[PDB]
């Protein structure tokens, strides 16, 4: 019944969802992001938001579905494979985590805004390779 909202109202609804996320209100934030992912099928921020909420609630497989779609919407964003790699790790899937942290390092290395993440992705990758070996 919310279909057809203006961008400016979507923006305020994204703000609302982001704020609930910052306050650790993950169930409520998840619902707001799930709404926005229905309203706008292409805005990667909404899928990042939905993923992050599910991750914080321990719903790793559902977090992976959101991160996977998001990554299709912004092929340059290092957060998707990075947080996906965390979920794979918590699921005991070392090969998935290694792939994600590898991709995240490559995406983050190409962008100066993401210099801290690049180093984290490299650190996590090294940690995971150490466990497989």
């Amino acid at each position: 019944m919310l279909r057809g909202l203006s961008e400016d109202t979507l923006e305020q609804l994204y703000a609302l969802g982001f704020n609930q996320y910052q306050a650790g209100k993950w169930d409520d934030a998840q619902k707001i992001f799930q709404a926005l992912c229905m309203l706008d099928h292409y805005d990667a921020r909404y899928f990042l938001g939905l993923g992050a909420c599910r991750q914080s609630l321990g719903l790793y497989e559902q977090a992976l579905q959101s991160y996977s779609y998001g990554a299709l919407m912004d092929i340059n964003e290092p957060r998707f494979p990075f947080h996906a790699a965390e979920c794979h790790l918590q699921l005991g899937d070392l090969d998935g985590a290694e792939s994600g942290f590898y991709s995240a390092r490559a995406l983050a290395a190409a962008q100066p805004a993401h210099e801290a993440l690049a180093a984290r992705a490299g650190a996590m990758l090294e940690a995971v390779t150490a466990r497989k070996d």
């Binding site: 994204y14 703000a15 982001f18 996320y21 921020r45 990042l48 992050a52 991750q55 914080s56 957060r79």
Partner: peptide, 8 residues
């Protein structure tokens, strides 16, 4: 945990 894009 995850760093989301700031709104406004």
């Amino acid at each position: 945990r995850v760093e989301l894009n700031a709104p406004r």
